[PDB]
Amino acid sequence: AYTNSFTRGVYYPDKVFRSSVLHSTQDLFLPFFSNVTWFHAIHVSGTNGTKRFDNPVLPFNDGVYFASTEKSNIIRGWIFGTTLDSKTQSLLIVNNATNVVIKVCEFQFCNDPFLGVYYHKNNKSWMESEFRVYSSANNCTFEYVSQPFLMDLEGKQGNFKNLREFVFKNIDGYFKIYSKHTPINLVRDLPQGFSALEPLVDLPIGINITRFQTLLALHRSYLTPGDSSSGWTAGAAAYYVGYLQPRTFLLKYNENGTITDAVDCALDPLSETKCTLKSFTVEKG
Amino acid sequence: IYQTSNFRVQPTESIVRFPNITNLCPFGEVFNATRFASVYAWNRKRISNCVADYSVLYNSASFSTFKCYGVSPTKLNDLCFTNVYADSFVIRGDEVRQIAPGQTGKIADYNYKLPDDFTGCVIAWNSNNLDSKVGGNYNYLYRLFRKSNLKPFERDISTEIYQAGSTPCNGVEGFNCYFPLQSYGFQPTNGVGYQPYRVVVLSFELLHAPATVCGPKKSTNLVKNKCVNFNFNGLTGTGVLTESNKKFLPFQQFGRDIADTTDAVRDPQTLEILDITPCSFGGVSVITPGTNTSNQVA
Amino acid sequence: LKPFERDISTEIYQAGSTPCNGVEGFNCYFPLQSYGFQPTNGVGYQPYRV
Numbered sequence: 032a033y034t035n036s037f038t039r040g041v042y043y044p045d046k047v048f049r050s051s052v053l054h055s056t057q058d059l060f061l062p063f064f065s066n067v068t069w070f071h072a073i074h075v076s077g078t079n080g081t082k083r084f085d086n087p088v089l090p091f092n093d094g095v096y097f098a099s100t101e102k103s104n105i106i107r108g109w110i111f112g113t114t115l116d117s118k119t120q121s122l123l124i125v126n127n128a129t130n131v132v133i134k135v136c137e138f139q140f141c142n143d144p145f146l147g148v149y150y151h152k153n154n155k156s157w158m159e160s161e162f163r164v165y166s167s168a169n170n171c172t173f174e175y176v177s178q179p180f181l182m183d184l185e186g187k188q189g190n191f192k193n194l195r196e197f198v199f200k201n202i203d204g205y206f207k208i209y210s211k212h213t214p215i216n217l218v219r220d221l222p223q224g225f226s227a228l229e230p231l232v233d234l235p236i237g238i239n240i241t242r243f244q245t246l247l248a249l250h251r252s253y254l255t256p257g258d259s260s261s262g263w264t265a266g267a268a269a270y271y272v273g274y275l276q277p278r279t280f281l282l283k284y285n286e287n288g289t290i291t292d293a294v295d296c297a298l299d300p301l302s303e304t305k306c307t308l309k310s311f312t313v314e315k316g
Numbered sequence: 317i318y319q320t321s322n323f324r325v326q327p328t329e330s331i332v333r334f335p336n337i338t339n340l341c342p343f344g345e346v347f348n349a350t351r352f353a354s355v356y357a358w359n360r361k362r363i364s365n366c367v368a369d370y371s372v373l374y375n376s377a378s379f380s381t382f383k384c385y386g387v388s389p390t391k392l393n394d395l396c397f398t399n400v401y402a403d404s405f406v407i408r409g410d411e412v413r414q415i416a417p418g419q420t421g422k423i424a425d426y427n428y429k430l431p432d433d434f435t436g437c438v439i440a441w442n443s444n445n446l447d448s449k450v451g452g453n454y455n456y457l458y459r460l461f462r463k464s465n466l467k468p469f470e471r472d473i474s475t476e477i478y479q480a481g482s483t484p485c486n487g488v489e490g491f492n493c494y495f496p497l498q499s500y501g502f503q504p505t506n507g508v509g510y511q512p513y514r515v516v517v518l519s520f521e522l523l524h525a526p527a528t529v530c531g532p533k534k535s536t537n538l539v540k541n542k543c544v545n546f547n548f549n550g551l552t553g554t555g556v557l558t559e560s561n562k563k564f565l566p567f568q569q570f571g572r573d574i575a576d577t578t579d580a581v582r583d584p585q586t587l588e589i590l591d592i593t594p595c596s597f598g599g600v601s602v603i604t605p606g607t608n609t610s611n612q613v614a
Numbered sequence: 615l616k617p618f619e620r621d622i623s624t625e626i627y628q629a630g631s632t633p634c635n636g637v638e639g640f641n642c643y644f645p646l647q648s649y650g651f652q653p654t655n656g657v658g659y660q661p662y663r664v
C-alpha cells in the first residue's frame with residue numbers, strides 16, 4: 032500500500048571522508064516521508080484468503096530503493112531490464128547459497144522466473160530444488176560471480192529481525208548497488224532509525240534499463256499437500272519499495288565518518304533553513 | 317619591508333600509486349590451442365572485463381608477423397580502450413598477405429575480410445608447431461565455390477552447394493557443381509609460405525560504452541617525508557605523505573576538509589592512511605635599511 | 615618534432631629491444647615510410663603541394 036519511510040535512503044555517493052562536519056550535496060536521494068509501496072511475502076492459508084502472490088513488474092524510473100524485512104530468508108534477487116526480453120540485453124541478480132551470480136545473460140522472463148526451496152529427505156535440511164529462472168540464449172557480454180557457498184536461513188515466523196536494504200542506481204552505466212545489513216526488532220513497519228547504506232559494487236556493464244522486478248523462492252516441503260505453486264506456506268517476510276528523486280540533501284558526518292543524520296533541503300521550511308544556512312541547528316531569526 | 321615571490325620548494329620525485337594487478341586477460345591461453353576455429357567459421361571471441369597485456373613481442377607465438385593497424389602498440393598498456401573482438405582463425409602463410417585493408421584472396425572471397433578503417437592489431441604467426449600435423453591436417457576447411465562475396469564482420473557456417481552456369485543441382489556433386497567446402501594440405505614438409513599460420517585479430521571500440529577494458533597500472537613504491545609529486549588512482553598533486561590515525565572506513569577511499577581540499581588518502585593496494593601535508597608556500601619577504609650607502613639586506 | 619625544424623635522420627628506428635643497424639625486419643622498419651600514391655588515386659590520397 033502506501034507507507035511513511037521515516038528516514039531511509041541515505042548513503043555515500045562520494046568515497047571521500049569528512050569528520051564532524053556537514054555537507055550539502057545533490058544526488059538521487061530518496062525523498063523523506065514519501066509514499067512507499069509495501070509488498071507482503073505472506074502465505075495466508077485461509078480458504079477465503081488468497082495466496083499473496085506479490086510479484087508484479089515495478090518501474091525503474093530513476094533509481095530504485097529497496098528494503099527487505101526478511102527472517103524466513105525467501106526474498107532473493109532483482110530482475111532488471113528495459114524490455115525484459117532475450118532480444119534486448121538486460122541484467123539479472125540471484126543470491127543462491129550466498130552466491131551472487133550477476134549476469135548480462137538476458138534469459139526468458141516469463142511469469143515464473145523464480146527460485147524454489149524444498150526440505151529434502153536425502154539430507155535433513157531445506158535444499159534447493161527449483162531453478163526455473165533461465166532458459167534462453169546466453170550471449171553474455173559479462174559474467175561476475177563471487178562464490179562463498181554458505182547458508183544463513185534461520186527462519187522465524189513470529190518476529191522480523193533481519194533487514195537488508197539495497198539501492199540500485201544507474202549513472203552513465205556504472206550500475207551501483209548500495210547495501211546495508213541490519214539486525215532489527217520491529218515487525219509492524221520500518222523502524223524509525225537512521226542507517227547509512229554502504230556501496231557494494233559498481234558494475235560497469237552499461238546496460239540500458241527501465242524495468243525492475245523482485246526474486247524469491249516458491250517451492251515448499253512435503254508436509255504441505257500439493258505442489259510448489261499450488262501450495263506454499265512458509266513465505267513469511269515483507270519488503271518496501273521507494274523511488275529516488277533528484278534532490279539536494281545535507282549530511283551530518285561524525286568523527287568516525289558515519290552518516291548520523293540527514294536533512295532534506297526541500298521538505299519543509301525548517302528543513303530549508305537548515306539547508307541554506309549550512310547548519311544542523313539555527314537560532315531565531 | 318617588501319615581498320617578492322614564494323618559496324615553492326620543487327617536488328623531489330614522482331610516484332604513481334595504483335591497486336594490485338588482480339585481473340588479467342588470458343592472451344597467452346587464447347594464443348595457443350590444440351584445436352582452433354576453421355577459417356570459414358572463424359572464432360569471434362568477445363574480450364572484455366579483463367586487463368590487456370603487451371608484455372613482449374616474441375611471445376609463445378613469437379609474433380611472426382605483427383602489426384597494430386590503427387593503434388599504437390607501444391602504449392597498449394597505456395592506451396585505454398574497450399570492447400575487444402578477437403576474430404581469429406587458421407590460414408596458410410601465403411594467405412597471410414590477405415590481412416591488410418582491402419586485401420583480396422580466397423579468405424576475403426568466402427572466409428574472412430577486414431575493413432578499411434581498422435583500429436586493432438593483427439598477428440599472423442607461423443603455426444609450424446601448433447597446427448602442423450606430421451601427416452598433414454585438412455580439417456581447416458575453406459569455402460571456395462559460392463556465387464556471392466562476403467564482407468568483413470560476417471561469418472558463414474552454411475554449406476549451400478554451388479551452382480555454376482545456373483545448372484540446377486539436386487544435391488549432385490559433378491561437372492560445374494562442386495561442394496563449396498575444400499580442405500588445406502598444411503603438411504610439415506611444405507614451404508614457409510605453405511606452412512600453417514594462425515591469425516588473431518584484435519578489434520575494439522574507442523570509448524563507445526563504459527570502458528570495461530583498460531591496461532595495467534604500474535605502481536611505484538611510495539616514499540614518505542618528501543615533497544613527492546603523487547599520482548594516485550583518483551587524483552594527482554604535490555605534497556608530503558605522512559602516516560596518520562584517521563580511520564578511513566573500508567568503502568571510503570578519500571578524505572577531505574571543510575573547504576573540499578583533498579589531504580587524506582588511503583593506499584591503493586594495502587590499508588595505509590596517508591595525510592598529504594603541504595609543502596613550503598611562504599612568501600619570501602625582504603627587509604632592508606635602505607638602498608644607498610648600506611646594501612645589507614635580509 | 616618541435617615546430618620550425620626539419621630533422622632527417624636516416625637511421626632506422628629502434629624498437630623491440632634490439633639495436634638494428636640498418637637491418638629491415640621485425641620491430642625495425644625504415645622510419646621514412648613512403649606515401650602510398652596511385653596516379654589519380656582517391657581524394658584522400660591525391661598528393662597536395664602545400
Ligand SMILES: *[C@@H]1O[C@H](CO)[C@@H](O)[C@H](O)[C@H]1NC(C)=O
Pocket residue numbers: 033034035036064065066067
Ligand atoms: C501516499 O499518497 C496518498 C495519495 O494522496 C497521500 O494521501 C498520502 O499522504 C501519501 N503517503 C505518504 C506521502 O507517506
Ligand SMILES: *[C@@H]1O[C@H](CO)[C@@H](O)[C@H](O)[C@H]1NC(C)=O
Pocket residue numbers: 168170
Ligand atoms: C549476440 O551477441 C552478438 C555480439 O557480436 C550480437 O551481434 C548479436 O546481436 C547478439 N544476439 C544474437 C541473437 O546473436
Ligand SMILES: *[C@@H]1O[C@H](CO)[C@@H](O)[C@H](O)[C@H]1NC(C)=O
Pocket residue numbers: 237238239
Ligand atoms: C539504450 O542503451 C543502449 C546502449 O548501447 C543503446 O544502444 C540504445 O539505443 C538505448 N536505447 C534507446 C531507446 O536509446
Ligand SMILES: *[C@@H]1O[C@H](CO)[C@@H](O)[C@H](O)[C@H]1NC(C)=O
Pocket residue numbers: 285286287
Ligand atoms: C566511533 O567508533 C568507536 C569504535 O569503538 C565507537 O566507540 C564510537 O562510539 C564511535 N563514535 C564516535 C563519535 O567516536
Ligand SMILES: *[C@@H]1O[C@H](CO)[C@@H](O)[C@H](O)[C@H]1NC(C)=O
Pocket residue numbers: 344345348349350376
Ligand atoms: C600454451 O602454452 C603455455 C606455455 O606457455 C601452456 O601453459 C598452455 O597450456 C598452452 N595452451 C594450450 C596448449 O592451449
Ligand SMILES: *[C@@H]1O[C@H](CO)[C@@H](O)[C@H](O)[C@H]1NC(C)=O
Pocket residue numbers: 335336338585586
Ligand atoms: C597488493 O600489493 C600489496 C603490496 O603493497 C600487498 O601487501 C597486498 O597483499 C596485495 N594484494 C593483493 C590482493 O594481491
